[PDB]
Design a protein around this ligand. Structure first.
Ligand code: SF4
Ligand code: SF4
Lengths: 623, 624
């Protein structure tokens, strides 16, 4: 009965029983061992060896301050600052890689890569100030855009380049508060400086720079990553695909791409479509080479190529347990190192491709733009060889894939509306669509897998609130059949009408974790057109099953941009009443939004709907 | 009280610990007594995501051997230590970046009261880094071009940091093969925070290699830019006399204590106290003078360039307020204990913060920037004079009499003492008069009796003809024991005493603040370049007997990664992993040519540093 309580899906239940009988420990098993304190409240501090310090509520009054004299407010806010910095650094390095990949294309030093979307390149470059971006040669225009993006990774700017997309009132508010992101790397470095012993000892000051650090992610690292990926590999358009472990085929070579970087996974797919490589699969007894995605790199291949997704966070271990995973191609971020051990229990080849994502015991085939075509060809060959060593008795692909619709970039959304946001604004004014909520969460073993994600998605569309899905929720919403146009039947009367009018699902898949920058861009476009602030728009954000530092950075820059953000579990901040009050209430007075911590998905829909209604009133609209 | 005598070796510290106990004031030793009790000290506690936190323990049932994500002790300890190093590099990185912004303000003409005090060093540094016509163009044009170069080291488009060219070719080629070449000061910090995220870098060798790269971006980037631009803006240090300990505070004067690391504020504070209208405000209040005294590294900075006396080091900062004569504390950022704000409220003292980065709840914030510093610092000295009129004379007790010291031993001053070349210094090392050099760069740590290890190790090394280069907190330790004066050659060995008397210098050279440990890198790289060898071939060493901060770990790491055997008094939070520990103590020797040494006995630490110096003298074909 424990296996039934760990997830809500049959394919996950099937593989949990399979690993149990085979003696394979999963992420849920190791979570039970680690359940048993001071670090979870954020009141443990390890920032120097004057002593590991813990702040307790003791009867005798001892241990109330650290050795240096820091109180619980400073200690909690510093750990939280480093937590956001690590989340921002995640997206930061990703955007920088995309800058390097575009610079290699511009220099002509990336065989097999091209500028797939030249029209978006000219638009983005013109938006950011590149002279004659409309008419100059594409590679020259790309080089000037590369310089611009790199300069946001420098230390000589007053505001990040894409920050111009925000409404003027939002930018003036950032100026007054001192939150204006100046440089992508610089805010990260200043956060690490402030959290050092004896530097920043004011929890209000620390949280304001956390907002500044997280804003440098959403409007810098992530937005550069999203826009440059569309330039290099194509801007997403609506298309059909499938989800869950059933996307693996018994008769094919199954290559699972895992991580966040489309630079590697896009070239993997190109190699599996080469004629000589497809021949090697048939020679090994396979009908084809089947590429399926995992986590954010899967979301990227889903949006731009329609490649089916095997599963989200907690499904990554179970996909190897199917016995049909012939290789796992990893880059970096959110790749559990337990996959290496579970792959050793089978024939699966675990291949790492990035100098930043090294895993002891893995097969490292380092991929760079100048050798990607050759290296990825070599990586696909290792998957065909591993296929010949597959043990057929241990194969169990549990379910049948579920149809989904993906590729809802802002470009695709506006094209569906006829090239303007006016029909969308009209529906919101009419009350057909009462608001929007972006669900951006992960999975967390503390919560039954996707129970909160699917319930909250169902609750919101019932109340005529459209849902924008990124990250892990894509698999959650898709498995429940909410990512298809026919799912309008499960929405309210107004939302179903608008969805059927446009032929779109009530849940729009807008991409990976960095593609939450698409939600910032969309909100900024609506606020600009209406002449109001983002904090005036009937919008919301939710992370019901989050776990990572990157999720908290996403939650933080949504709040600081005026988007009320709900979290299923609290961050490690409850040890300080002041820091907790600031996150839940005080931030509303400053940036116009705040955090919400609610483990009940229905109560969370009530809170998100309440803020949406209050903002409809301030626009002079009926709920 | 026998407990008070066990916490320091200095009478001016004992005298204030009695005073603090008499008045019910709790110090840093009292709070350290409460925080003695575990996994974080071994480094096996991970809080990088709310899928835990996770503790790696050893239980007979085999449970809790991996994190929820599956990470083992090696990865967890390495990521904690990696983030520990990144925090230290970030402290120096932001300090260096501010020095760039000040120089740009001078170049733009938007910093009233600031100048280019050392134009000759500006042209020299700019020419070294590739500025065209640095010798002849207008100074502000040259400064603007040097600012661009430094800023680009804080960008993401370079393959190697600008000052890395000072390193020997064999050292740079070695960094290239290992993948340690520092590319950008902020970038390595950001990549470290990326690598330590869940599910990114899960190989402890990979993590420590980038820890070395991150720390090298401090020593050859953030700190070196900070040191060299500070000399350009506020002057290159020259040898001079001064005093240390709490006796530098005067009962008859307005006592202003500068605290932190940034000379940009303290230099302008000092200029404000010499304005006639400000000196009048003090005289109108009944004071004989305005007395500025330094604390921590900013005190080291004012000591090197102005000769301003130092009140004390890390653990003395609380006691200086207890004297009752501290009329104001002017703070910028870093290593400023927030308990000072509360202790100042026990007296008349004004606690003033000046930086947007160093904010303290309950403090008086008068934010200083280059464009308003002359006006703002004038306002800050006035607050010190006003607080002086409210001083309680019954609570004043300045315990000891100041000790004479000699300071200001920049590499420029050292080469000038040698006739403009390192040849006499090389000759003494070849002759065996100076058997080696060791930089003692430590802090204070309440776990260790204050300066007991620093002073013992300093005495032990100079006795064995090993010259000691002192930075940071050790400056106060060496000075109080009377080792920072030329007459202290009598306490050195026969060979070292002879060389010291020939040059008229102490056997312990004070080379500046914590960021000025980049001066030691510059000196080592200069000797290795002259000799045609690697830094790992020089009879050199580094020691931090009483360290505590992330900055000390970053300094120790870029010393090791540069080939300098580094001794630590206390171990970093890494003992939870045998592999990470073996790599730090032994494995790194095979990779970068040096390793960490953890030894709490100062005499045994002198034995270890002397052994490596002897081994390297042998490989140079010299008499050991
Ligand atoms: S920074 Fe302060 S609270 Fe944190 S470990 Fe060091 S002494 Fe303790
Ligand atoms: S990163 Fe891994 S070891 Fe660290 S807290 Fe998260 S699950 Fe636990």
């Amino acid at each position: 009965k424990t296996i039934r309580s760990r997830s809500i899906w049959d394919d996950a239940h099937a593989m949990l029983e399979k690993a149990k009988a085979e003696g394979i420990s999963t992420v849920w098993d190791r979570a039970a061992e680690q359940t048993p304190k001071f670090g979870e409240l954020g009141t443990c501090c390890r920032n120097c060896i004057m002593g590991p310090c813990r702040i307790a509520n003791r009867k005798d009054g001892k241990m109330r301050l650290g050795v240096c004299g820091a109180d619980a407010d400073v200690i909690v806010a510093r750990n939280f600052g480093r937590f956001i910095a690590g989340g921002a650094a995640g997206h930061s390095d990703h955007g920088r890689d995309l800058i390097e990949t575009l610079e290699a294309v511009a220099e002509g030093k990336a065989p097999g890569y091209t500028i797939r979307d030249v029209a978006k390149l000219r638009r983005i470059a013109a938006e950011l100030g590149v002279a004659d971006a409309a008419t100059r040669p594409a590679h020259d225009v790309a080089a000037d855009l590369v310089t611009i993006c790199y300069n946001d990774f420098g230390s000589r700017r007053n505001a990040l380049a894409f920050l111009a997309r925000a409404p003027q009132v939002r930018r003036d508010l950032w100026q007054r508060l001192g939150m204006t992101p100046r440089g992508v790397d610089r805010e990260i470095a200043e956060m690490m400086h402030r959290t050092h012993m004896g530097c920043d000892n004011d929890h209000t000051s620390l949280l304001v720079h956390a907002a500044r650090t997280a804003l440098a992610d959403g409007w810098g690292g992530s937005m550069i990553g999203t826009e440059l990926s569309d330039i290099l590999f194509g801007t997403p358009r609506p298309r059909q695909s499938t989800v869950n472990l059933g996307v693996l085929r018994k008769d094919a070579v199954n290559i699972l791409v895992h991580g966040h970087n489309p630079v590697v996974s896009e070239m993997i797919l190109a190699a599996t479509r080469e004629p000589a490589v497809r021949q090697a699969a048939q020679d090994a007894g396979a009908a084809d080479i089947n590429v399926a995605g995992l986590c954010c790199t899967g979301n990227e291949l889903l949006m731009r190529q329609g490649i089916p997704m095997a599963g989200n966070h907690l499904m990554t271990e179970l996909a190897i347990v199917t016995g049909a995973a012939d290789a796992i191609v990893a880059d970096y971020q959110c790749i559990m190192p337990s996959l290496v051990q579970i792959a050793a229990c089978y024939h699966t080849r675990f291949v790492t491709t990035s100098p930043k994502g090294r895993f002891t015991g893995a097969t490292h085939v380092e991929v760079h733009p100048h050798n990607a075509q050759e290296r990825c060809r070599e990586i696909v060959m290792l998957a065909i060889d591993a296929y010949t060593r597959r043990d057929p008795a241990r194969v169990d692909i549990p379910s049948q894939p579920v149809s989904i619709m993906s590729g809802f970039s802002n470009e695709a959304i506006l094209e569906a509306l006829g090239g303007t946001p006016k029909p969308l604004i009209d529906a919101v004014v009419a009350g057909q669509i009462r608001g929007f909520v972006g669900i951006v969460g992960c999975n967390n073993p503390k919560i039954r897998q996707d129970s909160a994600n699917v319930t909250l998605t169902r609750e919101l569309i019932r109340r005529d609130i459209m849902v924008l899905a990124t990250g892990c929720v894509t698999t959650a919403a898709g498995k429940a059949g909410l990512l298809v146009p026919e799912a309008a039947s499960k929405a309210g009367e107004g939302l179903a009408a608008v969805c059927r009018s446009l032929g779109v699902p009530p849940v729009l898949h807008m991409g990976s974790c960095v593609d939450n920058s698409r939600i910032l861009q969309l909100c900024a476009l609506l606020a600009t057109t209406l002449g109001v602030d983002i904090s005036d728009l009937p919008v919301g954000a939710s992370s019901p099953e989050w776990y990572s530092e990157k999720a908290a950075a996403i939650a933080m820059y949504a709040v600081a941009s005026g988007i009320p953000t709900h979290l299923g579990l609290p961050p490690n901040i409850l040890g300080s009443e002041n820091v907790t009050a600031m996150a839940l209430h005080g931030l509303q007075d400053v940036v116009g939004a705040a955090f919400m911590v609610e483990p009940d998905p229905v109560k969370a829909a009530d809170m998100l709907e309440a803020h949406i209604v209050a903002r409809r009133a301030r626009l002079g609209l009926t709920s």
